[PDB]
Design a protein around this ligand. Structure first.
Ligand code: HEM
Ligand code: HEM
Ligand SMILES: Cc1cc(N)nc(CCc2cc(F)cc(CC[C@@H]3C[C@H](F)CN3)c2)c1
Ligand SMILES: Cc1cc(N)nc(CCc2cc(F)cc(CC[C@@H]3C[C@H](F)CN3)c2)c1
Ligand SMILES: Cc1cc(N)nc(CCc2cc(F)cc(CC[C@@H]3C[C@H](F)CN3)c2)c1
Ligand SMILES: C[C@H](O)[C@H](O)[C@H]1CNc2nc(N)[nH]c(=O)c2N1
Ligand SMILES: [Cl-]
Ligand SMILES: [Cl-]
Ligand SMILES: [Cl-]
Ligand SMILES: [Gd]
Ligand SMILES: [Zn+2]
Ligand SMILES: [Zn+2]
Ligand SMILES: [Zn+2]
Lengths: 402, 404
């Protein structure tokens, strides 16, 4: 009574036995599938803890031993005395890697074991927080040879407010409302841009203005910090055989670093745990630049390419989009900044799926997000059936602190 | 009532129709199985309950619920089943149920046309040679010398005891696939099995990679006999590219008429195991799926070689470039031959229009995001950023076991 899982390109079949351990409930019922939706005490804290502790001791091939019963005994003791408990550093590193490994919308998970974990649980203020973040950005960027990392700030605890990063990513471009009712810059960042303005930030008027950080220390208003310009590596976009493309003035940043997700580890919650990797070329080329509700350059490129934009049957959109993706890959390589194309990315995810079936008996995966947004069926994940479910440790969405 | 958002426009609706879904799918709160190709996995009291539901909405959709012939039609079905254990549909109900089953098909992107469907009633047929006639009429009326017209031919329903009408081919028009001396295929690998059956039931195999298969038609209880489609009834399109003159020399073609012939049509608790339907192609079905899938004709690297694309590295996006040109060639060829076809941008925008229509008429529309989104340029279409609810409504097309 585990689902059978077939790859239709190759004929392979597997059964997802891991989905039986799913430690939460999604939005789907037997009546109706909702897989496509973007947004799907002392005693329950104990069972999440116990399960996580059991997980940690399995991966160190020491389950059911002395140390295991001891650590299980310590935790309930501490939840009795304090209502919560503290992770050992090795548990935190393991918990943070498992969270990534468990993330169903991440096609990058072949890398989940190479994860640099920064322990900032001793963080005291918004100023210390900022220093940790610049240290993350510096390490992760590594002058173009990008490295995966995560910085863990102190956990939610009774008595104190949360540490929160208000920015959805550490590096984002401003989006300014215009006189045409429009947006100058990035329309997805209009709200945080208006929050930065009303917290003292003096805005620019360009299209690639890097936003300041809004950092919230517990029970403190958010404080504004400017990223030093030398810290944010950017890549100017040019096309290898379309020379007028460099005159569009387009840039993107090197480091994708998600900063508004909640990391959950054995019942403990970390509302601030930014993590960073490296880009897959379609996130920039296809989503960031071509989404109509983003930078929306697709017609401008196609017009410049002297394509026939009157009729859809000329496939001008598909043609413009492909060259924009080509320009992004060429540009990042010319600048020596790590980037993976959607063909290499999805081929390695398939290797991740086979590695995960042998170790855990399955792999949580959200097909609508794993398949790339152009050339879907040209990649090997298209023809692969996938099972989506929530394991813990996990990264979860959380409401905006404003 | 699930909230459903469109993330490119920001608009919000609620799907009230979903709650009126009955036959449960494969998902649970514990795990989503939306990506599976086969969800459902394949005392006449329950015939009456499906029959009365079907008659009720038949009478709702024409304002004539409460008083009138609506009362009287409910009694006739009652008596019909109490007498015979089954029942027969009025020709208007059969027409209505076929349009509903198309309208309810969650994977169909071309449902804006759901109201314009020619329904040939083939229920009074009792012969495989007769089936061949009906199929050949359908193909002629559907093809229409290239000006394609949606159509379905409804063969007799499954009756309790005694056999079943069935079409063994997956579609009415299929190319052969010939195994070799190394296990590779000449022609269409998707059809290596049914080609094997045609050979063992009589067919002399053919030349190469675009041989139209013979039909395999099964009258109830009798074995499937072969039938040979007359070549002038099978309109094909030789694929050329407008500016890549060598593309014609590749010798690729495709047929005009996509006609599915292995699905079961369910109306009012009745089942029609043979009910072949047809429409016209969306261009990516041919160029991207049939020609470019690795387990299909797999021509992608051949086209890239001739375009002198850097096949040494994936980062050149050579697969994306070749695929777009193959889709361009399909579109150009079909238009030159004046065979109805629709590109995936025109189709998905027609579907968004369908969704709004269906919002106002029924409070939503069942849609399968995985299949509605085209297989190239997905996020460039307006359906990509549209959240969608998948559920099962009746009437419906359903998968069924293969007759072997
Ligand atoms: C280093 C290479 C990485 C690559 C190539 C990568 C790629 C991606 C992509 C492409 C997506 C979805 C966006 C899309 O569909 O276009 C995604 C989602 C995600 N990734 Fe990865 N990622 C990487 C590193 C990481 C790391 C280091 C973590 C956590 C420690 C992580 C956690 C996540 C999460 C939680 C999501 C879902 C985000 C959401 O739902 O908003 N990823 N990743
Ligand atoms: C009129 C033009 C039509 C177009 C453009 C069209 C397009 C499509 C497409 C693109 C798919 C999914 C296959 C893919 O995306 O590669 C599909 C599936 C489907 N269509 Fe439509 N179709 C049309 C007519 C019809 C008609 C007339 C019927 C029935 C009366 C129908 C019933 C279905 C069904 C049942 C499926 C699901 C097939 C399956 O699950 O195997 N379609 N259609
Ligand atoms: C570490 C990392 C590396 C990488 N290379 N890529 C990513 C994913 C970035 C990404 C992609 C998306 F497609 C959408 C988002 C945010 C959308 C979600 C949806 C909810 F609204 C909250 N934020 C973020 C993360
Ligand atoms: C009338 C019509 C028009 C059109 N334009 N397109 C179609 C769909 C053709 C099609 C496309 C697919 F992508 C897959 C299938 C069959 C899939 C499942 C797998 C099972 F084996 C049985 N059917 C059929 C039908
Ligand atoms: C149906 C669907 C499928 C899919 N595969 N993908 C999407 C887009 C998901 C997405 C990606 C993003 F990158 C950003 C958003 C908007 C969410 C944030 C949260 C705040 F509200 C501001 N916008 C949504 C939608
Ligand atoms: C595994 C995956 O769900 C399956 O291959 C589906 C995905 N979406 C599809 N979409 C279309 N249009 N046609 C298909 O055959 C498929 N196959
Ligand atoms: Cl991004
Ligand atoms: Cl112009
Ligand atoms: Cl087909
Ligand atoms: Gd040039
Ligand atoms: Zn589901
Ligand atoms: Zn998008
Ligand atoms: Zn395919």
């Amino acid at each position: 009574k585990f689902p059978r899982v077939k790859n239709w390109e190759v004929g392979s079949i597997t059964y997802d036995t891991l989905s039986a351990q799913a430690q939460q409930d999604g939005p789907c019922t037997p009546r109706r599938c909702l897989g496509s939706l973007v947004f799907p005490a002392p005693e329950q804290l104990l069972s999440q803890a116990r399960d996580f502790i059991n997980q940690y001791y399995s991966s160190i091939k020491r389950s059911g031993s002395q140390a295991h019963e001891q650590r299980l005994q310590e935790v309930e003791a501490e939840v009795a005395a304090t209502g919560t408990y503290q992770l050992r550093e090795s548990e935190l590193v393991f918990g943070a890697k498992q969270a990534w490994r468990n993330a169903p919308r991440c096609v990058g998970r072949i890398q989940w074991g190479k994860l640099q974990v920064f322990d900032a649980r001793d963080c005291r203020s918004a100023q210390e927080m900022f220093t940790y973040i610049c240290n993350h950005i510096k390490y992760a960027t590594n002058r173009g040879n990008l490295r995966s990392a995560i910085t863990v700030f102190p956990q939610r605890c009774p008595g104190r407010g949360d540490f929160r990063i208000w920015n959805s990513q550490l590096v984002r471009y401003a989006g300014y409302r215009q006189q045409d009712g429009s947006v100058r810059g990035d329309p997805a960042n209009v709200e945080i841009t208006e929050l930065c303005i009303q917290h003292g930030w003096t805005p620019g008027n360009g299209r690639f203005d890097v936003l300041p950080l809004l950092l919230q220390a517990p029970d403190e208003p958010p404080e504004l910090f400017l990223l030093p310009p030398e810290l944010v590596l950017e890549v100017p976009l040019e096309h290898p055989t379309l020379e007028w493309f460099a005159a569009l003035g387009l840039r993107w940043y090197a480091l994708p670093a998600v900063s508004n997700m909640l990391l959950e580890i054995g019942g403990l919650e970390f509302p601030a745990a930014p993590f960073s990797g490296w880009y897959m070329s379609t996130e920039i080329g296809t989503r960031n630049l071509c989404d109509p509700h983003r930078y929306n350059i697709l017609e401008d490129v196609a017009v410049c390419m002297d394509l026939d934009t009157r009729t859809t049957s000329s496939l001008w959109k598909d043609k413009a989009a492909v060259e924009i993706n080509v320009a992004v890959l060429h540009s990042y390589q010319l600048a020596k900044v790590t980037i993976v194309d959607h063909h290499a990315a999805t081929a390695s995810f398939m290797k991740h799926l086979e590695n995960e079936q042998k170790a855990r008996g399955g792999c949580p995966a959200d097909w609508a997000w794993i398949v790339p947004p152009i050339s879907g069926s040209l990649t090997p994940v298209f023809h692969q059936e996938m099972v989506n479910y929530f394991l813990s440790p996990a990264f979860r969405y959380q409401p905006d602190p404003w």
